[PDB]
Design an enzyme around this catalytic site. Sequence first.
Site, PDB file in Angstrom:
ATOM      1  N   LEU A 113       0.824  -1.438   0.080  1.00  0.00           N
ATOM      2  CA  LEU A 113       0.194  -0.390  -0.112  1.00  0.00           C
ATOM      3  C   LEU A 113       1.164   1.220  -0.136  1.00  0.00           C
ATOM      4  O   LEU A 113       0.125   2.096  -0.736  1.00  0.00           O
ATOM      5  CB  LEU A 113      -1.116  -0.190   1.082  1.00  0.00           C
ATOM      6  CG  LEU A 113      -2.919  -0.877   1.606  1.00  0.00           C
ATOM      7  CD1 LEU A 113      -2.215  -1.819   0.253  1.00  0.00           C
ATOM      8  CD2 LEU A 113      -2.516  -0.765   2.446  1.00  0.00           C
ATOM      9  N   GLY A 123       8.041   4.874   2.067  1.00  0.00           N
ATOM     10  CA  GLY A 123       8.484   5.815   2.929  1.00  0.00           C
ATOM     11  C   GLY A 123       9.630   5.592   3.470  1.00  0.00           C
ATOM     12  O   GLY A 123      10.663   4.218   3.848  1.00  0.00           O
ATOM     13  N   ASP A 166       4.346  12.947  14.112  1.00  0.00           N
ATOM     14  CA  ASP A 166       4.633  12.427  12.676  1.00  0.00           C
ATOM     15  C   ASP A 166       3.224  12.906  12.557  1.00  0.00           C
ATOM     16  O   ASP A 166       2.260  12.524  11.784  1.00  0.00           O
ATOM     17  CB  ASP A 166       4.811  11.295  12.586  1.00  0.00           C
ATOM     18  CG  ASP A 166       5.070  11.605  11.424  1.00  0.00           C
ATOM     19  OD1 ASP A 166       5.255  12.417  10.273  1.00  0.00           O
ATOM     20  OD2 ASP A 166       5.205  10.075  11.023  1.00  0.00           O
ATOM     21  N   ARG A 207      -1.615  13.321   5.862  1.00  0.00           N
ATOM     22  CA  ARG A 207      -0.244  11.708   5.717  1.00  0.00           C
ATOM     23  C   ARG A 207      -0.706  11.026   6.586  1.00  0.00           C
ATOM     24  O   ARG A 207      -0.033   9.524   6.196  1.00  0.00           O
ATOM     25  CB  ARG A 207       0.745  11.938   5.219  1.00  0.00           C
ATOM     26  CG  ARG A 207       1.466  12.377   6.360  1.00  0.00           C
ATOM     27  CD  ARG A 207       3.634  12.270   5.484  1.00  0.00           C
ATOM     28  NE  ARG A 207       4.569  12.529   6.799  1.00  0.00           N
ATOM     29  CZ  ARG A 207       4.749  13.748   6.904  1.00  0.00           C
ATOM     30  NH1 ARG A 207       4.125  14.216   6.643  1.00  0.00           N
ATOM     31  NH2 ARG A 207       5.836  13.666   7.593  1.00  0.00           N
ATOM     32  N   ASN A 208      -1.426  11.569   7.374  1.00  0.00           N
ATOM     33  CA  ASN A 208      -1.344  10.118   8.986  1.00  0.00           C
ATOM     34  C   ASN A 208      -2.161  10.307   9.858  1.00  0.00           C
ATOM     35  O   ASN A 208      -2.528   9.845  10.700  1.00  0.00           O
ATOM     36  CB  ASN A 208      -0.031   9.861   9.912  1.00  0.00           C
ATOM     37  CG  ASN A 208       0.898  10.484   8.702  1.00  0.00           C
ATOM     38  OD1 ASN A 208       1.237   9.712   8.044  1.00  0.00           O
ATOM     39  ND2 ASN A 208       2.887  11.103   9.568  1.00  0.00           N
ATOM     40  N   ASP A 211       0.059   6.200  14.399  1.00  0.00           N
ATOM     41  CA  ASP A 211       1.914   5.400  14.323  1.00  0.00           C
ATOM     42  C   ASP A 211       2.111   5.195  13.770  1.00  0.00           C
ATOM     43  O   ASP A 211       2.153   4.168  13.101  1.00  0.00           O
ATOM     44  CB  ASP A 211       2.234   5.892  15.623  1.00  0.00           C
ATOM     45  CG  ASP A 211       3.395   6.042  15.670  1.00  0.00           C
ATOM     46  OD1 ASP A 211       4.265   7.107  15.430  1.00  0.00           O
ATOM     47  OD2 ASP A 211       4.139   5.232  16.931  1.00  0.00           O
TER      48      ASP A 211
END
Lengths: 48, 282
Positions: free
Chosen positions: B16, B19, B134, B138-139, B152
């Site tokens: 999926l 990074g 973070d 995007r999270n 996380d």
Amino acid sequence: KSLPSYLNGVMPPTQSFAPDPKYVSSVPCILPIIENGKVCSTHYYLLP
Amino acid sequence: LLRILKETEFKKIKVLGSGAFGTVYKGLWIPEGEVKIPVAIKELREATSPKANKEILDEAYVMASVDNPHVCRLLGICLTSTVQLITQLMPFGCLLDYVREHKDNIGSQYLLNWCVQIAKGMNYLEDRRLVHRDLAARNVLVKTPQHVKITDFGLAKLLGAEEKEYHAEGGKVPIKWMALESILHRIYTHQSDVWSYGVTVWELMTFGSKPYDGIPASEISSILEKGERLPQPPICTIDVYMIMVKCWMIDADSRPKFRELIIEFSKMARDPQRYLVIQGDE
């Protein structure tokens, strides 16, 4: 009504809050991650 | 309280994403005396010190225990030569992709509720003494377009009893989401998470824009020191924008707290059209 007026809706990259001392601080080495030619544009190497 | 999984229990169907952290998989989990559960499997690929592994684990024990609508529970962990975090699959995907692809299906109500939900989740983790480190769009993941969740990818830190700060060792880091003290000094706190909350919020209101677009991350610490910050979103009244901006105050303790952020965005969410002016949302 306190909405920003921009020419044709276009934002500038930044907007200044200078000379407000809460936002003005009163230069480290950043390197991209590149395996040919950038497999990730959000993260960078941070060195001294 | 944190489930240790054997490699036999689970399989990776699909990739999926990738990074700095590593790789995320579509996967299937079969618990031992059983049902198949569709899961995401994050494989961390940083060659960890002992220091690093202890830190991930401690973070993992906490994540295993979470019981809040707006944070993803760690379902299990498979340590071998690599750490693998197993978590419930979110087929809708992440919020950054959503606002880019489904801008037209997003009104002021959705947006301020997203803000509240993320604040609540982030506050929950702050009570757990977890510096997330973070937060970005995007999270944040979409369970359903009304309901979103923070996750996380192994980078969060549990602060010990009398610790306010976490001092990072150097690594691959999302410069344009980071508070200035995290770039100059590599210092991470609940208030540096607040900074990144602001940026998260900017992304939402600009329906997925790239922050500081056309300014190389190498220049970011400078422009911040000079008082430059992300611009006012087109849809935002001044009241909302000023909340975002206060998150980017130089003095970290002077920024808002997630507590205040919840109360504030929650008031706004009872009269959304007052605070976000979006075409066709009248």
